[PDB]
Design a binder for this molecule. Sequence first.
Ligand SMILES: *[C@@H]1O[C@H](CO)[C@@H](O)[C@H](O)[C@H]1NC(C)=O
Ligand SMILES: [Cu+2]
Ligand SMILES: [Zn+2]
Ligand SMILES: [Zn+2]
Ligand SMILES: [Zn+2]
Ligand SMILES: [Zn+2]
Length: 233
Amino acid sequence: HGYMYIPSSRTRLGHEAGIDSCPECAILEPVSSWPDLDAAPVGRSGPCGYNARDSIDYNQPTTNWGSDAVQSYSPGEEIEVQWCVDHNGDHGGMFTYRICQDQSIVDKFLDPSYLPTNDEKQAAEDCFDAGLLPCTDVSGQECGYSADCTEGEACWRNDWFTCNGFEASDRPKCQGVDNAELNSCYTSIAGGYTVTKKVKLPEYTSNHTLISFKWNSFQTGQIYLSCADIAIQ
Ligand SMILES: *[C@@H]1O[C@H](CO)[C@@H](O)[C@H](O)[C@H]1NC(C)=O
Ligand SMILES: [Cu+2]
Ligand SMILES: [Zn+2]
Ligand SMILES: [Zn+2]
Ligand SMILES: [Zn+2]
Ligand SMILES: [Zn+2]
């Protein structure tokens, strides 16, 4: 149970708007999330998430999210990206952030009068994958391999970020990464912990595009997807 926190995602804004009672509850399941991180289709969840708790499809804007960029950044900027894990739903695993570079695909997620089809959602996922923001593109960031993977498996990749070992790495699981305090970010079930990294943006400008967050659970056959509206200017 988790969702993208900084820049503020559609899911964060939906909670803040009184629409989403459980932002951390937006789940793609059941899926094979491990060890082949990109295998499972995204179905209804798409790159922005679907929350079955209150039946919210974040892939299309509403009066409460998706109309405009929440934050503007510069081309090639190394930016802070943060997600929030609930105290009772820290499943370990690996996560990543992506920007789809095809504005024509992105634009299908920016129209309040249009709901993308499941095919469109998968096409977008494939574009996001081609635009993954590698951990190792940030100068000085340490990009480890997962304690829950072995060499050469499909999970053995440090473009993605990893949570700590589900034994610990001292500081087990996702919460161990920042080792932050409880309620450092909002979750509804048991209170949230931050999970904070940097990514390097691409070098083109756009007035309105999307970062999509994807977290592949280790403990469970679940994927957590969110997206944030951003500008690169
Ligand atoms: C954003 O849109 C405004 C108004 O059309 C334009 O002046 C500006 O150049 C655009 N920015 C981009 C394309 O990064
Ligand atoms: Cu969970
Ligand atoms: Zn609140
Ligand atoms: Zn993918
Ligand atoms: Zn694969
Ligand atoms: Zn190093």
